[PDB]
Design an enzyme around this catalytic site. Sequence first.
Site, mmCIF file in Angstrom:
data_model
loop_
_atom_site.group_PDB
_atom_site.id
_atom_site.type_symbol
_atom_site.label_atom_id
_atom_site.label_comp_id
_atom_site.label_asym_id
_atom_site.label_seq_id
_atom_site.Cartn_x
_atom_site.Cartn_y
_atom_site.Cartn_z
ATOM 1 C CG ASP A 270 4.419 2.142 -1.139
ATOM 2 O OD1 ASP A 270 5.489 2.504 -0.760
ATOM 3 O OD2 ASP A 270 3.816 1.749 0.098
ATOM 4 C CB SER B 288 6.928 0.312 6.301
ATOM 5 O OG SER B 288 7.760 1.270 5.299
ATOM 6 C CG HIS C 296 4.909 4.470 2.337
ATOM 7 N ND1 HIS C 296 4.940 2.869 2.467
ATOM 8 C CD2 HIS C 296 5.535 4.515 3.625
ATOM 9 C CE1 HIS C 296 5.375 2.261 3.287
ATOM 10 N NE2 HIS C 296 6.168 3.096 4.210
#
EC number: 3.1.1.-
Length: 259
Positions: free
Chosen positions: A198, A105, A225
Site C-alpha cells: 500500500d 486513508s 489499498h
Amino acid sequence: SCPDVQMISVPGTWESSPQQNPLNPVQFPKALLLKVTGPIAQQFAPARVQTYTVAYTAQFHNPLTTDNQMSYNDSRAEGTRAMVAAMTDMNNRCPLTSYVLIGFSQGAVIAGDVASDIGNGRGPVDEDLVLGVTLIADGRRQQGVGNQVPPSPRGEGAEITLHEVPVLSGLGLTMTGPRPGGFGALDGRTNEICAQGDLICAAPAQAFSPANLPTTLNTLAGPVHAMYATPEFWNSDGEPATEWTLNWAHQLIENAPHP
C-alpha cells in the site's frame, strides 16, 4: 443526553460528502469504516456510545486529469475542520465524554493530524479524554511514531517520502512530512495499520524511480489499498484490519469510564 463515549470515524477519499448525516451515513454504503462503526452501534446502547462519521468532501483532484474534484489540500482541510468541530461540539455539550478516533486513508491523515494536536496539548480536547486512536493507511505514517500493528511494512507514508518533492504542494496536494510532535501524549494509544504494497502508507523511495513511477501513479490513483476488509494483504492471526479495529474499539468502550 450525553453518550459515555463518542466514536469518531473519518472516511477515506470517495467515502464521504458534506451532505452525509454523520449519525446515519448512508450515502457511501461501501465505505470501509462502516464495517467498524456499524457493528459498534449494534453492540452498545446509545447511552454508552455514539458513532459519528465525519461529513466532508473527501476528494483528491488529479492535476494530470480533467476530473471535477476538489484538491487534496482543500478536501483534507475541510475534513480536519469537520472533525475538530465534532469534537468541539461534543466536548462543549458533554465535557465528561471520552473519544475513540478512527480514520482511513485521507481520513487517517486527518485523524492522525488531530490526534497529534490533542497529544501535544493543542486541543480541541484534553488528551485524557481520548481512549485510543487507530489509523488505517495513514499517508503520514512514520516508523517509530505510534504503535505499528504487526505486521508493519517497511517504508513510510507517501507524504513523508515525497515531502521534499517540488511542484506538488503548489498543484494542491501538499506532502506534509512528519507530524510535528508525533502523537505526543497519545503515542502509546495510537495505532497504525498498513498493508505491504500500500503505497499510501508504505512508500519506499524506489517506488518513484523512473522504472516504477508510472505503475506507482496508477496504484495511487486507485489493489491492496482497497482490501482492508479482507485478510489478503494484512491480517493479525487471520483477522482483517476492520475486524482488528472493531475488536479494539469494543474493548475500549467496554472499559470506558462511567461519568
